[PDB]
Design a protein around this ligand. Structure first.
Ligand SMILES: CC(C)(C)OC(=O)N[C@@H](Cc1ccccc1)[C@@H](O)CN[C@@H](Cc1ccccc1)C(=O)N[C@@H](CCC(=O)O)C(=O)N[C@@H](Cc1ccccc1)C(N)=O
Lengths: 99, 99
């Protein structure tokens, strides 16, 4: 739908059988979730933002249901303060900015 | 206009007589710009993101022209790696997410 920015753009997502809330973030190249049990293989990675860099684990082809849409993509799991849905998934659900 | 997320959502902004590029970021409560000479009074502040926290200076009622729209709001200036336009200004230009 259409979502204004008067409040944080938080949505419900389903990933790995669990329900979580996540921030739709146009300024994030990647999707990064707070520490969680995810199954499968992975490679370590380092990502950066305002404040510096953190080490996360990268899982590829993970199924996530964002609002009503299912998408498969990479999800980084590590010490982020909040779950953020980045552009790698936002393009999959057809998300656009408008003004 | 309508902007997809296949690439970073970078726009041209004019602030303090200078031209700069900035990222439209729905996941940022605030607008934070790389170190720049801005005139006026300010209060120190600390902001956080993925990676930790940084110290910035806060200027209120600063005029910024984002794309074709003029807006007046708070702008944080400090050591951010890239200029980000946060929700405090995105609401001013009527920016919405859609999918
Ligand atoms: C700007 C500020 C007011 C301090 O708010 C946030 O940081 N907001 C974050 C959400 C949040 C707010 C408050 C509390 C908790 C959580 C989120 O929107 C962050 N958005 C961008 C802001 C930003 C972009 C670029 C530079 C500096 C800052 C970001 O860090 N995005 C990261 C997210 C992690 C990721 O996607 O990997 C990113 O795209 N990083 C890229 C590019 C990069 C590399 C190295 C350094 C900086 C940026 C990357 N591939 O690592």
């Amino acid at each position: 739908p259409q979502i204004t920015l008067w409040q944080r753009p938080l949505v419900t997502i389903k990933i790995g059988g669990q329900l979580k809330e996540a921030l739709l973030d146009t300024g994030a190249d990647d999707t990064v979730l707070e520490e969680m049990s995810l199954p499968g293989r992975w490679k370590p990675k380092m990502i950066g933002g305002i404040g510096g860099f953190i080490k996360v684990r990268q899982y590829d082809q993970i199924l996530i249901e964002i609002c009503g849409h299912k998408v498969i993509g990479t999800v980084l799991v590590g010490p982020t303060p909040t779950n953020v849905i980045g552009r790698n998934l936002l393009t999959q659900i057809g998300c656009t900015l408008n003004f």
